[PDB]
Amino acid sequence: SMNPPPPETSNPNKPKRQTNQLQYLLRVVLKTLWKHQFAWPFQQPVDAVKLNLPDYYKIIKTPMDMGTIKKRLENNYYWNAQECIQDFNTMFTNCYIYNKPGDDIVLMAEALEKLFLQKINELPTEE
């Protein structure tokens, strides 16, 4: 069994900038979700080898996790907030696609997603 390489967190060919929205996504959104009691399965890529999920990366072809997002924010990898918001949504959607309603991991994603929604509702206007 073998895991794929993780998503990239650096790339000089990718355009990027800092924005107050992206600052908010790190200081408020990522920080809030990262400290949550249910964050830990989402803090790094799914290790399909150690978890014995050999079909994981047959079903999930756009991997994402908060470890990757955290690095992308810390590295100022993004051009805009939408790119980062999309990564969070991919992470949640992957969980729901792979798993089943009522599963513990789905309850965990739901709890993180609730907070994510609450925070992005007050994404500041671009300055």
Ligand X SMILES: Cc1sc2c(c1C)C(c1ccc(Cl)cc1)=N[C@@H](CC(=O)OC(C)(C)C)c1[nH]nc(C)[n+]1-2
Q: Which residues bind ligand X (CB under 6 A)?
A: 41-42, 46, 51, 53, 95, 98-99, 104-105
Q: Does residue number 74 form part of the binding site for Cl ion (CB under 5 A)?
A: no
Tell me whether residue 84 or residue 95 sits nearer to ligand X (CB atom).
95
Q: Does residue number 11 form part of the binding site for Cl ion (CB under 5 A)?
A: yes
Q: Does residue number 13 form part of the binding site for Cl ion (CB under 5 A)?
A: no
Rounded Cα distance between 50 and 87, Å, is 24
Shortest Å, Cβ 99 to ligand X: 5
Q: Provide the 10 A C-beta neighbour count for residue 49.
A: 12
Q: Name which of Cl ion, ligand X, none residue 51 binds, using a CB cut-off of 5 to 8 Å depending on partner kind.
A: ligand X
Rounded Cα distance between 14 and 75, Å, is 12
Rounded Cα distance between 123 and 88, Å, is 14
Which ranges in 1-127 belong to alpha helices (H)? 20-24, 31-35, 56-59, 66-74, 81-98, 104-120
Shortest Å, Cβ 94 to Cl ion: 23
User: Can you give the binding site for Cl ion, defined by CB under 5 A?
Assistant: 10-11
